[PDB]
Structure formats: structure tokens, C-alpha cells
Amino acid sequence: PKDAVHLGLKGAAVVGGIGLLFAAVRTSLARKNVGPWAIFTRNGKLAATFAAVGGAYDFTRAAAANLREKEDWVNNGIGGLFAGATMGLTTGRIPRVLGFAALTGVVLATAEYAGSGLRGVFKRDVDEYERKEFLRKNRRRPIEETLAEIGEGRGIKPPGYYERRAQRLKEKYGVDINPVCADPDQ
Amino acid sequence: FLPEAMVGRSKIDEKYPDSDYPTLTDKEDPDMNGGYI
Amino acid sequence: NITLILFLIGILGFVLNRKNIILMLISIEIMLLSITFLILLSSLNMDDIIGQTYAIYIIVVAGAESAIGLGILVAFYRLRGSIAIEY
Amino acid sequence: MIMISILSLLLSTSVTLRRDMSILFNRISIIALAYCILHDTMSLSFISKGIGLHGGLLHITNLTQIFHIFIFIISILILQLTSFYPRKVWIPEYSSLKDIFFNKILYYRTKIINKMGEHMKIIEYPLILLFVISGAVFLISTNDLVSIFLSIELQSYGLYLLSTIYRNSELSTTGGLIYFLLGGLSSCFILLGTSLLYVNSGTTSLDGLYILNSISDVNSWYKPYYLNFSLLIFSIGFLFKVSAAPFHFWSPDVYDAIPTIVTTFVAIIAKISIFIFLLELVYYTNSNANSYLSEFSWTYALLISSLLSLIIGTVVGLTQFRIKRLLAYSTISHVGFILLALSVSSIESTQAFIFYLIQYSISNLNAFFILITIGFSLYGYVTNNKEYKSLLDKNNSPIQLISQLKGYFYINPLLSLSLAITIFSFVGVPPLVGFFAKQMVLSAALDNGYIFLSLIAIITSVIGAVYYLNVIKEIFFYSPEHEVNPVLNESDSNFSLRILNEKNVLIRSVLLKGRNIFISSPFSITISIITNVILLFIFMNKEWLSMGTILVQILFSA
Amino acid sequence: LDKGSIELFGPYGLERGLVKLSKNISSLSTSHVTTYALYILVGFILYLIYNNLLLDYSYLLLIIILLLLLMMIGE
Amino acid sequence: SRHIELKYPEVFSHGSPFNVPAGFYPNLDHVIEHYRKQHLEEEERKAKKLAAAAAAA
Amino acid sequence: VGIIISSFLFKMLPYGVIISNQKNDLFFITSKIWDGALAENNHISSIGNIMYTNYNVWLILASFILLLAMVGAIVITIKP
Amino acid sequence: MVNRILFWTGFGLAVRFWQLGIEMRPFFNRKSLWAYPLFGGVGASFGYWLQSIDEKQTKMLEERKQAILEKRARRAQRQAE
Amino acid sequence: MAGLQHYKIAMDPALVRLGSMISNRYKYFRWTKRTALVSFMYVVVVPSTIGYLAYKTDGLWDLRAKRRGDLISER
């Protein structure tokens, strides 16, 4: 388990701090003699918007892990989905709320599923020659291994298919399979 | 230190006007067909 | 630690400067002196003449670079009449 | 050899003030670089990860010597632009080998060949170019923190001087000022990074830094955070000089402001030297064991810059209308690919990196040569366009607008096709050399698990293709706004050409028109060879790809 | 759909938005050497922060998406 | 490769020859023997290649 | 900028430079040697011992930069 | 069909052709015809030289493959303990 | 008007104007409650319905050589 509120606060701080930095650059780059307190008067919304998004991101992903009791890539998706919605909330247009949510959710989930090399990669630390060798000539597999993942039917009828179907049909419809004979003399 | 004709935002907006992408309201375009009568 | 503060001062020259490109050259010289100051104190702590030799080459290169930059600025002023950005 | 050529050229240049010597001095610089190629060609009959030279301050590797030669060859090709006049007079009665070698042609050439053009009257131009080359070769061969700093200043300072050598242009002097000012900031980051390495490790030797890093990569009193943190500051200064995002802003202004012939050298030479030098530094600091050090690896700055260069380079290029600013943003996009291959350090990515850099340098070279040649081909054309009439420094940069290429396919179709082939190679359309370059980088990135960056690379490529297609649309889909000069061919304006033998005796006379003025052979042949290398790569790829395979196998040789 | 939503949630919407995004990013290129100097400096600090603080990579991607959001909005 | 081969093994001969304190320089005989072996091994490898694969032709 | 840059850059300084900046104060102690002091060089002589022989590649490189600076600053500023 | 000599003889011929096309000069006037045997001859020279690079490159790559297998073998025999 | 000379046609301006509106109508699409509902129905609902039905009946039946005393059902 994890504290969604506590983790969300840290998320708001990290990205609000970055937003505050970008707020300072806008204030520094102002042309008119506005002053040092332009940080929270003109550009203040920028820092607030950044704190709102990264806080929402860290809250909803932390909450998503707590609700599902799982730690997988999906949680980064809903976190981005909520963070993107918060980004679009500032514009005030419903399509931008959804579209911005979708992009943030998709991008952040895709990065987490594939493990983007932004900070390190999943180092195999194994014999790569043996890995590629095994995948290369694994030409024939046990049939059950295939059947475990595509199943029976749809043209996949391994030997003994009919006996199992006979058994399967009896357990469901309560009917014994006795096909008729086309030859009167039998 | 460089001329606006080579770096200014204005000349880009001349090359790519916002008017090149129309934006009508439902009042002037309920039927989304460019105000066709 | 003094060298760190001096490097900040040279860094802050760019942050506090919208229109004065002459101050831009000076900030680069403060940063170069700050880095050379740091090398010199470290080589005194580590008893290494190579650090002093490194400082001497930075001084030479910094002097040669100031020469080129003042030259480029003169070729710029001759056609312009100002070293001021209209910001 | 490069140091002897510089000193000997300087001495001859010192005692001359004659500006008609510029074309001759440029041709000698070509001869000098050909000897440099010969000496480095002889220096490739050993196998080593590296041999330290001159007290350990420099080093040589097979990779170092290959890219020494490559820098020389690109520099000979660029040096043609200042060694031959842009236009020639050709007629079918002075075309035999006996005519070229024993006969001579006499005519008033000054206006036709642009004998007193600006790029033909700068005496010290080939000399400053050689200084930049020396900076670049020395940086490839540097084994030492002080040698790194000296080499990078030497190459950088010559580039600032090259950007300002057209001292009578306000645009050129402005771009030189911008390059020097922001390049001085980036040099401070390089000196800061080198200095923090020294004050922490007590060594200037790159060998010694790699040894300390190798021992520190084990799986408490002096935990070595400094190495990654120093190289991070160190690398940012080098990211500026290759104009990688987000340190890219300077190059679209500088490349557009300086004259186009200068841009060709300035935009190409520096990336080769910095990327090659970065390659070795990336390999020898790669933490094999997943420890705390890998968490703060300085090479993530390369990967972030790669991401940002992919996006900025393609998105910002969409609304560029000045042709040289588009090429600057196109380079930043291609730098994103180069940075991805360098960041993933694998045999496949290093092969991809080596091949990508060389193909990109010859392709960006073909684009600049075609742009210059088109500009020099409008000599016998006129336009009434009002936009073209308000362009600045027209002589320094004859083509400045993409709109200037409108209908150029109707002016010269085969030269327009060469431009289209080069641009389609930048997109990565098979079977051009650019596709195979992009294909190799994507392969390695996917094989090392860089999927997210692989996907951003393909998505950015479609966006980048838009402004590439827009240049091609301009050339092909419209009629031109340029018309042949009426007076250049007016049925009564013939200039005289005398044909004479070895004894200076007149053989025949002939009357000539604007229709007898052509692109000079050095530029047409260079465009033709490179265009056919881009086009026919699929039949020529074995030896070129094998060279990179062998080089990487040496660098990784356990 | 075909002459409607598919065009807007497709090529035509991309053309509208990306041209706007391209023009807003290009507005930062003022050619003011003092402004580029500050840009290099802020980029420097951001790289230092990302590596020094061992930041979550998801934060960096969120930051980039946010920056595109802002450059979507003019002025 | 994880092991780093010195591009410049001669760095083992660096050091000022002046004002040397007695017993200052660490003994390097195992180091020189390491590079003696590296040299003798390489010469043998060439010797057993252009004298053994040359007898065929 | 001051807080961010200073906080990161200070952690990089080795213990030597931060030994005497910001009760139990530490004291540096020194003694003499005799073999080491047989013929001392001043710092300028110690640099001169190695500057032209061991590290003379740096000296050559610096000369080229000085050369380039001389020719470059002259070419861009004066009428030929 | 990738015969190096014929291919690079052809490459030289295509360079001259493209160059004449870029220059907007006629592809075949009689007094210029010596250029095609010349460009093709230079192309043939480049390809005899590429031939010998390929021979060296193949040998180098063959030695490298053996070394990798030899390296793989000894490491495998080391793990036998 | 388009390369080869064609026959004289009484090109009716109203019909030509209608043809121009159809070519340019994509430029004027907007997201409204109506357009979003229609677009969602055609793109999401109906396809997902066929997808769900195809999913649930995949492999359900086989006709080949089925006699009396047998079932069409396989699952």
C-alpha cells in the first residue's frame, strides 16, 4: 500500500517547482518594469497549473495502485489520463480536456509498458548469444503449449478432438452424440 | 540583432495566416458547411 | 568556495542582463577566472605543478579568446554604431 | 602535414596582399589535404583500441584515423567552392582532349565567371579553414583533459572567425557575434566539467579517469559521484556545439545569417569531430554493472537531447519559409537520430552511429552544393517578384527563400531531381542511403529496449517529412517566377571567343551567347557522384558497411 | 465522419494544431543573444535537476507534454 | 570489454627526477615483467604465423 | 538560479577546497624533509622543467590558437 | 548481379551522364565522347581498389569470428569447474 | 480548363457552388453534442458491438458433415 495524498503532494512539488522556474523566466523576460512580484501576479497561474497537474498525476496513479492492489503499467496510464484532463481543464473546452487527457495517458502508459530508457534500461545481464540462439531455432514446440493459448476449434482439432467435444457437449446440453448412419445395411 | 524579415514572428504569420483555417460559430454556420445557404 | 561564489556571479551576469552584450563578455571572463581559481587552489592542495600549468594555458586561451571576441565586436560595431539590443 | 601546410600557407599569405591569389591559395589547400589523406592512409596497418602518443597527450585508433581521412575528404570537397569559378563557357568545338590540353580559348570572362566575386577575394579564407580542420583532427586524437580544451577552443575560435570573415556584411558580422557569444558560454561549461574532473580525480589523463571509473564500477568514503556529474556539465557544452535541442536556438539564426558557402563548412565539420570524440567517452564510462552510478549516468543528457531534438527539429521546421533556416532545423532533427545511436551503447548502435554520421555529412553536403549551384545558375534569369527584391545580402546567399525554388524543375530538371533525391534521403524513403541509415538506428534501439524512443522517432519522421515534401512541392508543382534574361540571348548580342593553339596562333573564332554558359564541372560532378551514391547505395553497401563493422568490433574487443 | 470528425481527429486537425504549435515555438527565436543565453542557462539547470535528484522519468515526460500544452496556447 | 588496456603504458615511467626522497617511488618490477610478457607473447604469435603458415607456400 | 546551481556545485568540491569555509577546528601541520629539499625549484622553474619537454604538445596547440587569434582579429577588422 | 567491376564501370558512366544532364549540356557530341571511357575507366579503377578492400575486410571479419568463438569456448571450459 | 479541350458545357453556377461546398466542408466541422454523439456511435459503439458479437461466437458453430444425432454447436 501507499499514501495517495502524501505521494500526490510530492508530485505537485516537483513539477510545481519546475513551473515556478518557468514562471521566473517569463518574469525575467518581461519587457515592462513590472517588478519581482510578477512571479505570482502574472506568471503565478503557470506555476499553479504545473503543481496541479503533477500533483494530480501522482495522486491518481498512487490511488490506482491502491484500488487494484497491483503495480503495473496501467496505473501510469490513468495517472496521465487524469493529469491530461487537469491540463485541459485550464483551457475550458471539453474536447481539449479529453484529447489532452488521452495524449498524456497514452504517452505515459506506453513509456511504462516498454520501460523508456530515460533513466536506465532493464539490463539482461545474461548471455545474449544464448538468448538469440534459443529464440532462433525454437522451431518446434509441444503442442499443448500452443493449445494453451489458441485453444481448440476454429480449425484447430488435434487428435482426440471429437471425444473431448462429445464429453464437452454432454456436460453442457445433456445430449449424447450419436450421429446417424447413411447406409441402410449398416 | 537580426532583421524581422528573417526572424520575426510577423513574417511567419504572413506565410501561415490563422485565417487559412476557418473558424465559424454555429450562429453563422449551424450546418457546419461553411455558411452555405 | 570563493571560486563557487565567483562562478555564480558570472552566471548571474546572464540572468540579470537583457540588453548589454558587453556585460556578456565580462561574465564569460569572470567564469573563466573562477574556474582557473578553482584549479589553482586544488593543485596547491594536491601538490601538482600540472594544475598550475593547466591554469597558465587557460589564461593564454582566455586572452586569445578575448582578442577574437573584441575583434568580432569591432567588425559588428563598424556596420551598426551600437552595442545595445533594442529590447 | 596539416601543421606544415598551415605554416607554409601563412608565410606565403603573409607577404602577399594580392586578392587574385585567393583562388590559387584555395587550390593549394586542396593539394595539402590530399597529402594529409596519404599520410593517414599509411597509418592504418595495425589493430588497437588505442596507442597513446607524444607523452600520452594524444592517441590514435583505427576509428581516429578513418575519421581523420573523412574530415580531410569533406574539406577538399567544400574547398572546391572557393577553388573554381561557378560558371564556364563550353562549346562543342573545344571539347576534345587535344583542345583541353594543347589549345586555349580567349574571351572576356570577368562578368561571366564572376572573377571578382566576394568568395574569390578573401586571401586568408583557405587558411582559416585549415585552422578549423586542425582543431577538429586534434580533438579526435585527444587523450587528455587539457588537450580536449585546447582542441575545442581551436576549432571553435576558427568557426567564429569564419562566420565573420565577410566583414562587409551586416548579416555576417551579426551571426559571428552570436556564435562567439553563446559559444563562449558553452566553452565555460566544457572547462568547468574538465576542471571538476581534475580537482576530484587528481589526473588530467583520460586513461586514468577510465581506470578510476572501472574500479568504482564494482556492483564508501569517496563515492565517485563526480565523474557522471562532471561529464554531464562537460557534455552540455558539446550539445551546444552540435546544436542539439534544447541548446539549438543559435544555429538557425547563425546558419541563415552567414554566407551560404561558409555555412556549408560551418554546419558540417564540427558535428563530425564532436560526435566522434563523444563516442569513445561514451564507451569507456558505460557502467556495465547496474550500480548507483548508472542511476546518475551523464549519458541521459544525450538521450533527453535526442528526444528533444527529434521533436523540436521536426515541429519547428513546419513553418520555416527561409531555406537555410529549414536546413538548420532539419540538422537538429537528424542530430536527434545520431544522439539516439550514441546513447544506446551497443555493437549495433555504434555501427549505426558510424554509418549515420558519414551518410548524413555527404547528404547535407549535397544539399548545400545544390543550393549554391542553383543560386549560381540564376545568373541568366530575371524575376519581377517583389519579395525577392527585398532580400538582404543577395550576393552572399542567392537563394534564401523556399519560394525562390518555385518551378525550378522547369528551369533545370536533372538538378531538381538531384535535390529531390537528397531530400527524400533525409526523409528515409527506401532504397536511398538515408532510409538504410534510419533503419539501422531503429534496429539497434529496438534490440536494446529503446521502444519509446523508437516510436517517437517514427512519429517525428512523418512530421519532418511534411516540410521536406513542401520543398519538393515548390520545385515541381508550380511554374517558375524566373525567366531567362532577354538580353542574354537577344539574337544580336554575341560575345567573341578565340581558340588558339600551343603557339598562341588563332585557329578559329566563334560567336557565343548566354546559352553557352554552364555550371562549372567541379560542382556538377560532385553533385552527380553524391546523388548517385545516395541513389545506388543498395548495390554498393558491402565494403562501406563492413568498415564500420570492423571498427566497432575493435572498439568492443574483449 | 469522412468529411467531418475523421478529418478533425485526423490529418486536418493535425495540420491546424501543428502549424499553430510550430509558430508558437518559433516565437521564442527572437535572435536576441541575451535571450538565447538565458535559454541555454535554464536548459542547463533542468538537466542538472533531472540527474541530481534522480527524478522519476514519468515526471520528465509530463513536463514535456505540459510544455507542448502551453505552446498550444498563444500569447 | 570491461578491462581497460592502457593506451599509454609508458606513464609508468613518468615522475620528476629531481629532489627524490629515498624510498619514495614504489617498486615496479612486476609491472615491467607484465609488459615484458605482453611483448614476448606478441612477438611469438607473429613468429609462429609467418614461419608456420608460410611453409605451406 | 543561485539556490539550484550552488546546491549542486558545492557537493562537487573536494574536501581540500572546503576544509576552511563554514569549536573543534582542525589544524594543518607541516614538517621538513632534507632529500626533497636538496635543490628546490621555484614554481616557475618547476613549470619550466616540464612545459617544453613532457607536455610540449600543449605548448604547440597554444601557439596555433595564438596564431589563429592574430591572423583572425586582423583579417576581420582592417582594410586589405 | 553485383559484379563490382562492371557495376563501378557503370557508376562512372552514370556520373558523366548525370553531370551532363545537370549542366544541361548534350549527352552525346562526338568530340566529347572520350569522357565516357574516362569516367567509366576511373570507375573501373574504383572497384578494383574496392575489390582488394573487400578481400582484406573478409579476412579481418573471419579472424574476428574465430576469436569470438575461441573466447566463447574457453569461457565455457572455465565454467566446467 | 483542364488540359485537353472538352466540349461546351452549360456549367450551372449553383451546381458548381454545391460541388465546391462538398470539397471544402471538412474545413468547417466542429465538435458539438450532436456531432460527438454521432461520431461516437458510428466509430465506437457499432464497431465494438460487432467486435463483441464476433468475439463471443468465434468457434461456436461448425456445419461440416453434421448429421442427425449431432449438434451444430462446438463449444
Indicate if the alpha-carbon torsion angle C63, C64, C68, C71 is positive or negative. positive
Query: Is D161 an interface residue toward G (CB < 8 Å)?
Result: yes
Burial of F39 (C-beta count, 10 Å sphere; 0-12/13-18/19+): exposed
| Residue I72: CA count within 13 A, CB half-sphere | 4
Query: Closest by alpha carbon to D49, among G78, F9, G72?
Result: F9
Q: How far apart are CA C15 and CA C24, in angstroms?
A: 10
Task: Work out the minimum CA distance from F16 to partner chain G, whole angstroms.
Answer: 9
C-alpha cell at H76: 565455457
Task: Work out the minimum CA distance from C11 to partner chain E, whole angstroms.
Answer: 8
Contacting chains of I (3 CB pairs or more, <8 Å) are A, B, E
**D–H contact: 3+ Cβ pairs < 8 A:** yes
Helix axes C49-80, G43-51, angle to 10 degrees: 80
Q: How far apart are CA F39 and CA C87, in angstroms?
A: 67
Rg of chain H, C-alpha, whole Å: 23
Find the length of chain F: 57
Q: DSSP letter for I73, please.
A: B
SS3 D476: helix
Indicate if the alpha-carbon torsion angle C14, C18, C21, C22 is positive or negative. negative
Which alpha helices (DSSP H) does D378-503 contain, by range? 386-389, 413-427, 433-447, 451-476
Q: How far apart are CA D425 and CA D433, in angstroms?
A: 6
Query: Is E33 an interface residue toward A (CB < 8 Å)?
Result: no
Residues D161, D165, D170: CA angle, nearest 5 degrees? 110
CB neighbours of residue E51 within 10 Å: 21
Q: Which residues contact B22 (CB under 8 A, 6 or more apart)?
A: B34, I27, I28
Chain E 9-38, residues with CB within 8 Å of chain B CB atoms: 15-16, 19-20, 23, 26-27, 29-33
Q: Which residues contact A175 (CB under 8 A, 6 or more apart)?
A: A169, I71
Longest Cα–Cα distance in chain D: 91
C-alpha distances in angstroms, E68 versus D304, E18, G1?
16, 10, 24
Residue pair D194/D187 in contact (Cβ under 8 Å)? The answer is no
Chain E 28-67, residues with CB within 8 Å of chain D CB atoms: 28-29, 31, 33, 36-37, 39-41, 43-44, 46-48, 50-52, 54, 60, 64
Q: How many CB pairs under 8 A join E and G?
A: 9
Q: How many CB pairs under 8 A join B and D?
A: 21
Q: Which residues contact D390 (CB under 8 A, 6 or more apart)?
A: B5
C-alpha distances in angstroms, A158 versus A143, E75, I72?
9, 67, 19
Q: How far apart are CA E68 and CA D301, in angstroms?
A: 20
Residues D546, D547, D551: CA angle, nearest 5 degrees? 115
Long-range contacts of G10-13 (CB under 8 A, 24+ apart): G10/C1, G10/C4, G11/D225, G12/D196, G12/D200, G12/D225, G12/D226, G12/D229, G12/D230, G13/C1, G13/C4, G13/D199
Q: Which residues of E touch I26 (CB under 8 A)?
A: 3-4, 7-8, 12
Q: How far apart are CA D76 and CA I65, in angstroms?
A: 79
Instruction: At D519, give phi and psi (nearest 5°).
Output: -50, 135
Query: Is I21 an interface residue toward B (CB < 8 Å)?
Result: yes
Residue pair G57/D55 in contact (Cβ under 8 Å)? The answer is yes
| Residue D461: CA count within 13 A, CB half-sphere | 19
Q: How far apart are CA D515 and CA D469, in angstroms?
A: 32
Residue pair D404/D388 in contact (Cβ under 8 Å)? The answer is yes
Query: Is E52 an interface residue toward G (CB < 8 Å)?
Result: yes
Q: Which residues contact A15 (CB under 8 A, 6 or more apart)?
A: A50, A51, A53, A54, A55, A57, E59, E62, E63, E66
Task: Work out the minimum CA distance from D105 to partner chain F, whole angstroms.
Answer: 58
End-to-end CA distance of chain G: 46
Chain H 19-58, residues with CB within 8 Å of chain D CB atoms: 19, 21-26, 29, 31-32, 34, 50, 53-54, 57
Torsion of CA D112, D117, D119, D121, to 10 degrees: 120
SS3 A103: helix
Per-position b or e across A86-98, b if 16+ CB within 10 A of its CB: bbbbbeeeeebbb
Query: Closest by alpha carbon to A96, among B20, I31, D315, E5?
Result: I31
Residues D134, D139, D145: CA angle, nearest 5 degrees? 135
Resolution in A: 2.5
Choose from A167, A178, A183 for mutation: most chain I CBs within 10 A: A178
Task: Work out the minimum CA distance from C18 to partner chain E, whole angstroms.
Answer: 5
C-alpha cell at F19: 629532489
Give the chain D residue whose CA is nearest to the CA of C56. Answer: D146
Instruction: Give me the DSSP letters along D67-102.
Output: HHHHHHHHHHHHHGGGTS-SEEE--TTS-SHHHHHH
Query: Closest by alpha carbon to D399, among D486, D471, D330?
Result: D471
Find the length of chain B: 37
Q: DSSP letter for A33, please.
A: -
Specify the DSSP element, H or E, that contains F21: none
Please report where in the chains the cell 517517437 appears, as a residue. Answer: D456
Choose from I28, I30, I32, I35 for mutation: most chain B CBs within 10 A: I28
Which alpha helices (DSSP H) does chain B contain, by range? 4-7, 9-15
Determine whether the interchain pair B2/D174 forms a contact, defined as Cβ–Cβ distance below 8 Å.
Answer: yes
Q: Which residues of B touch E4 (CB under 8 A)?
A: 32
Instruction: Give me the DSSP letters along I47-68.
Output: HHHHHHHHHHTTTSB--TT--T
Specify the DSSP element, H or E, that contains D301: helix D300-315
C-alpha cell at A137: 531455432
Residue pair D375/D519 in contact (Cβ under 8 Å)? The answer is no
End-to-end CA distance of chain B: 51
C-alpha distances in angstroms, D423 versus D363, D399, D419, D429?
9, 17, 6, 9
C-alpha distances in angstroms, E47 versus E72, H21, I2, I56?
24, 51, 58, 52
Please report where in the chains the cell 544522439 appears, as a residue. Answer: D339
**H–C contact: 3+ Cβ pairs < 8 A:** no
**For residue A5, what are the domain limits?**
1-116
Instruction: Give me the DSSP letters along I1-51.
Output: --SS--------HHHHHHHHHHHHGGGG----HHHHHHHHIIIIIHHHHHH
Q: How far apart are CA G1 and CA A30, in angstroms?
A: 17
Q: How far apart are CA E15 and CA D239, in angstroms?
A: 31
Choose from I40, I63, I73 for mutation: most chain A CBs within 10 A: I73
Q: How far apart are CA D104 and CA D96, in angstroms?
A: 12
Determine whether the interchain pair I75/A177 forms a contact, defined as Cβ–Cβ distance below 8 Å.
Answer: no
C-alpha distances in angstroms, D419 versus D126, D321, D408, D521?
27, 17, 10, 17
Q: How many CB pairs under 8 A join A and D?
A: 38
Give the chain E residue whose CA is nearest to the CA of C17. Answer: E34
Q: How far apart are CA D347 and CA D283, in angstroms?
A: 10
| Sheet with D506-512: strands ordered across | D104-106, D495-500, D506-512
Task: Work out the minimum CA distance from G61 to partner chain C, whole angstroms.
Answer: 10
Helix axes D413-427, D451-476, angle to 10 degrees: 170
Residue pair D227/D194 in contact (Cβ under 8 Å)? The answer is no
Q: Which residues contact I8 (CB under 8 A, 6 or more apart)?
A: none
Residues D68, D71, D75: CA angle, nearest 5 degrees? 140
Which alpha helices (DSSP H) does A115-155 contain, by range? 128-136, 143-150
C-alpha cell at G52: 617544453
Give the bridge partners for D381, in sequence order. Answer: D484
CB neighbours of residue I4 within 10 Å: 5
User: Which among B21, B26, B34 has the least Cβ separation from residue I25?
Assistant: B34
Determine whether the interchain pair C54/D146 forms a contact, defined as Cβ–Cβ distance below 8 Å.
Answer: yes
Query: Is E8 an interface residue toward I (CB < 8 Å)?
Result: yes
Q: How far apart are CA D468 and CA D363, in angstroms?
A: 14
C-alpha cell at E49: 535537476
Task: Give residues preceding each break in chain G, C–N over 2.5 A.
Answer: 22
Query: Closest by alpha carbon to C58, among D192, H13, E25, D115?
Result: D192
Which alpha helices (DSSP H) does chain H contain, by range? 4-23, 35-78
Report CA G79 to chain centroid distance, whole Å: 39
Residue pair E47/A65 in contact (Cβ under 8 Å)? The answer is no
Determine whether the interchain pair A151/I59 forms a contact, defined as Cβ–Cβ distance below 8 Å.
Answer: yes
Residue pair D351/D440 in contact (Cβ under 8 Å)? The answer is yes
Q: How many CB pairs under 8 A join D and H?
A: 75
Task: Work out the minimum CA distance from B6 to partner chain E, whole angstroms.
Answer: 10
Residue pair D217/D293 in contact (Cβ under 8 Å)? The answer is yes
User: Which among E38, E53, E66 has the least Cβ separation from residue A50?
Assistant: E66
Instruction: Fill in the amino acid letter for D348.
Output: E
Burial of C47 (C-beta count, 10 Å sphere; 0-12/13-18/19+): exposed
Q: Which residues of I touch A95 (CB under 8 A)?
A: 31
Instruction: At D317, give phi and psi (nearest 5°).
Output: -65, -15
Q: How far apart are CA D111 and CA D98, in angstroms?
A: 27
C-alpha distances in angstroms, H13 versus B11, D91, D530, D537, H20?
46, 21, 14, 16, 11
Number of H helices, E strands in chain A: 8, 0
Determine whether the interchain pair A117/D455 forms a contact, defined as Cβ–Cβ distance below 8 Å.
Answer: no
Helix axes D170-201, E33-52, angle to 10 degrees: 30
Q: How far apart are CA D542 and CA D519, in angstroms?
A: 33
Which alpha helices (DSSP H) does G1-80 contain, by range? 2-10, 43-51, 56-75
- Domains of chain C, residue spans: 1-80
Q: How far apart are CA I57 and CA D247, in angstroms?
A: 57
Query: Is C86 an interface residue toward A (CB < 8 Å)?
Result: no
Report CA C64 to chain centroid distance, whole Å: 12
Q: Which residues of G touch D17 (CB under 8 A)?
A: 80
Residues D157, D159, D163: CA angle, nearest 5 degrees? 120
Residues E58, E61, E64: CA angle, nearest 5 degrees? 150
C-alpha cell at A186: 449398416
Query: Closest by alpha carbon to D362, among D154, D109, D533, D231?
Result: D533
Per-position b or e across B1-36, b if 16+ CB within 10 A of its CB: bbeeebbbbebbeebbeeeeeeeeeeeebeebbbee
Determine whether the interchain pair E34/C87 forms a contact, defined as Cβ–Cβ distance below 8 Å.
Answer: yes
User: Which among D150, D168, D204 has the least Cβ separation from residue C50?
Assistant: D204
Task: Work out the minimum CA distance from F22 to partner chain G, whole angstroms.
Answer: 7
Q: How far apart are CA B26 and CA I70, in angstroms?
A: 62
Query: Closest by alpha carbon to E72, among D176, G13, A100?
Result: A100
**H–G contact: 3+ Cβ pairs < 8 A:** no
Determine whether the interchain pair A110/D294 forms a contact, defined as Cβ–Cβ distance below 8 Å.
Answer: no
Query: Closest by alpha carbon to D409, among D365, D466, D370, D363?
Result: D370
Residue pair D161/C68 in contact (Cβ under 8 Å)? The answer is yes
Give the chain E residue whose CA is nearest to the CA of B18. Answer: E20
Torsion of CA D423, D427, D432, D433, to 10 degrees: 100
Determine whether the interchain pair I31/A95 forms a contact, defined as Cβ–Cβ distance below 8 Å.
Answer: yes
Q: Which residues contact C75 (CB under 8 A, 6 or more apart)?
A: D164, D167, D173, D176, G76, G77
Burial of I65 (C-beta count, 10 Å sphere; 0-12/13-18/19+): exposed
Instruction: Fill in the amino acid letter for G23.
Output: K
| Residue D346: CA count within 13 A, CB half-sphere | 20
Query: Is D226 an interface residue toward E (CB < 8 Å)?
Result: no
Looking at domain C1-80, does it have CATH number 1.25.40.10? no
Structure determination method: cryo-EM
Determine whether the interchain pair D191/C38 forms a contact, defined as Cβ–Cβ distance below 8 Å.
Answer: no
Burial of D279 (C-beta count, 10 Å sphere; 0-12/13-18/19+): buried
Q: How far apart are CA D313 and CA D499, in angstroms?
A: 53
Instruction: At D484, give phi and psi (nearest 5°).
Output: -55, 140
Q: Which residues contact D518 (CB under 8 A, 6 or more apart)?
A: D87, D88, D89, D90, H23, H24, H25
Q: Which residues contact A177 (CB under 8 A, 6 or more apart)?
A: A165, A166, A169, A170, I69, I70, I71
Contacting chains of H (3 CB pairs or more, <8 Å) are D
Residue pair D442/D456 in contact (Cβ under 8 Å)? The answer is no
Specify the DSSP element, H or E, that contains D484: strand D483-484
C-alpha cell at B4: 524581422
Q: How far apart are CA D1 and CA D40, in angstroms?
A: 10
